[model samples]
Target: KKTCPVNFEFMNYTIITSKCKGPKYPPKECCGAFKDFACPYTDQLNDLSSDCATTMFSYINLYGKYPPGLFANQCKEGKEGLECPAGSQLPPE
Candidate 1:
């Protein structure tokens, strides 16, 4: 369990709300959706936003599929650590 900034919390809420209510919203929309929100500590807020998006988008249903090379590059950059399930290499790097 990790604590997140207020902005990150609101951003995630917005994203989840849009996701559940409509056709599909792109993950990047989360960023723009909450752009006007204030954050006194921007560095911390930015990290939280990144971590939050990574976790949210990691879900197959939430994000559909990672773009080609995107998932592996994220892993290699330490953005996330995900193990491909057996019989799946569809989103190869």
Candidate 2:
């Protein structure tokens, strides 16, 4: 079993918190939702290098009917990965 440091309940976090719905997973929302879920464990997740990405996405894919590379392809900006913006923002919470 490949262990991971950040013990995020992948299925619930992405599906519940991220709410990455299908047909039209809007860029802003999906990316932001991913940002929301990933930011908290920023250091830890990234620390695991490539392993964490697959580990988390493994369960997330099982739970949510998301297309492969849906996030990987879309969620990109300036190469530093995604960042959670501060100061001004709005969300349906």
Candidate 3:
């Protein structure tokens, strides 16, 4: 019934700074997303430790370039917000 392989998992990441955050070294279950999607560091956010969640988001905000055909109007206009940012891309639907 489905042409493509059905693979969808509800990824759960701890919240950091009011934003979604994960770990620097993800578990095996955390697959097919960022190569560095971890969760341990996020669980211990009070320590002020840095992890993939912090690193990735920071990178996107700074050095990331917007891609074509991302979630339209998802980003505020006139701001250099990431559509997908680095280490990520807009999936073709």
Index of the highest-TM-score prediction: 2
Candidate 2 on 1-93: residue-level lDDT in tens?
346665545235643334667787776667767766655654555554435566666665566767766665556632334544542221111
Candidate 1 per-residue C-alpha lDDT over 25-49 given as tens digits, one digit per residue, 9 for 90 to 100:
3433322222212122334424533
Q: What is the C-alpha lDDT of each candidate?
A: 0.33, 0.55, 0.28
Q: In model 3, how many backbone clashes occur?
A: 2
The better candidate by lDDT, 2 or 3, is 2
- Identify the runs in model 1 with alpha carbons over 4 angstroms from their true place: 1-21, 26-31, 37-41, 46-93
Q: lDDT for model 1, on a 0 to 1 scale?
A: 0.33
Q: Which ten residues in a row have the lowest lDDT in candidate 2?
A: 84-93
Q: Score candidate 2 by TM-score against the native.
A: 0.65
Better of 1 and 2 by TM-score: 2
